[model samples]
Target chain A: GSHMASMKNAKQEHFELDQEWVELMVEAKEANISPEEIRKYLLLNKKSAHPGPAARSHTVNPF
Target chain B: GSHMASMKNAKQEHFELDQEWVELMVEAKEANISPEEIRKYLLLNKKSAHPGPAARSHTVNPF
Candidate 1:
């Protein structure tokens, strides 16, 4: 939706949820996964797939 | 549902949603809200939005 902030203004960036995350989120939603699980998945992806508890449960890393 | 499933053809020519809206969507999403919730929040800020919530939320979204 929004896009005018000019990410370049704040240049230096790291793994933030992008298209890959979006796809995963959508799948999780469709599966009716709980919000807590969704949050964990999102967090893992945000950290560039730093695997944790759910790492064994989920397959794709998307990093 | 695809446009083909609609009762009529698609049309586009409005003032256009601002970039701020997309950014907001991104932020609310990373917070682990349901898609229904995201839709709820965006509608509230559609008229007069300040990217503050989204910007702040982005930082938290990452780490």
Candidate 2:
């Protein structure tokens, strides 16, 4: 429940479109952005710098 | 520390970019995307649909 801090102030809106549909479209766009970064991270680091996924937290999942 | 699941299979690469710099640029781009969604979420639903931030988890924060 601690995540509420970031969203505590989160606000959203819509116009002529359905709200759920808008959320899906935005999700699609956002997905395109993070994958590219991760892809580049793997390409350059070559497994030497990364903590091998063991250091990651469960909260970071995209979904 | 459970957040690592998402990164378990994550892979990245780089071309002419410094990895960290690439991250920033991607972050900037992703930021541009989510805010618009939130903004639109607020516009249409007004105050009827959202759970009032009380049910949010700790991992959903953008940052």
Candidate 3:
């Protein structure tokens, strides 16, 4: 947890990322997301680095 | 060592990440990722949250 948490949202809010989701991010980013690739993909996939499989992870994995 | 700590059990892994690696990640996340741009970077970087690398009297959480 971010020890310097505020009365508003805790620092932990900013400091923490979901392990499962980050795992996916690493997979997607590693899915050819080099430093250069991020600049390119950012043009098309704004959410390219965003980790909500909710859209894809939802629509595809019904089984 | 955790009681579940064993020769073959990675299950003892509590969404674990390398502390040193997390250090690098924290730097990178701050350097490039913007507030709007930060999410997955958030996930993978919070595992350690150690207050200054074992400066306390607590047991070393190292594996």
Candidate 4:
């Protein structure tokens, strides 16, 4: 439907560091963890919890 | 809901650059635009699109 329309307006959409995204990345770097690793982890794994907004929540951090 | 659970498993979440994300950033950079500026743009704007998968499609280009 509006896929192209959205694509057409792609220029209008904004992209930001999302501070959280940056902080998460930097935090990973400092922990000697690779961002790629984090991406793969989330892409491949499913949440241990039930369905909910948080169910989709994925994060990278020191443990 | 499971924010904490998600946060708890945050370490398991992936954080890859997402080729498209990287490409978009590079495209933006080469075009003399700052990633920070792009970030601000996305954070502040609304999509002309309706709620849907493609509706969220956003891109940066040389046009």
Would you list the C-alpha lDDT of every candidate in the order shown? Answer: 0.43, 0.40, 0.40, 0.40
lDDT of 4 by residue, A1-63 (tens): 454454465456556534435543344333333334334444445334344455456787788
List model 2 lDDT by residue over B1-63, tens digit each.
454434544333322323443343343343332334434544553322223347756885787
> For residues B1-63, what per-residue lDDT tens digits would candidate 4 score against the true structure?
454533532242333433434433333322333334333444544233233355565669665
Assess every candidate by TM-score. 0.21, 0.15, 0.20, 0.20
Cα error, candidate 4, residue B37 (Å): 28
| Interface Cα root-mean-square deviation for all models | 11.2, 13.7, 10.9, 14.7
- Model 1 accuracy (lDDT, Cα): 0.43
Clash counts for the predictions, in order:
7, 29, 3, 11
Model 3 bad stretches (over 4 Å) = A1-21, A37-63, B1-26, B32-63
Give the per-residue lDDT digits (tens) of candidate 3, residues B1-63. Answer: 557644763332134233333333333433333323334454453443224355657665985
- Chain B TM per candidate, please? 0.26, 0.22, 0.22, 0.27
Docking class of 4: incorrect
Assess the local accuracy of residue B49 in candidate 2 as a C-alpha lDDT between 0 and 100. 25
Q: What C-alpha root-mean-square deviation, in Å, does candidate 1 show against the real structure? A: 23.7
TM-score of chain A of 4: 0.28
- Cα-lDDT of candidate 3: 0.40
Report the error of model 1 at residue B32, Å.
12
Q: Which stretches of candidate 4 lie above 4 Å from their native place?
A: A1-17, A34-37, A45-63, B1-63
lDDT, residue B24, model 3: 33
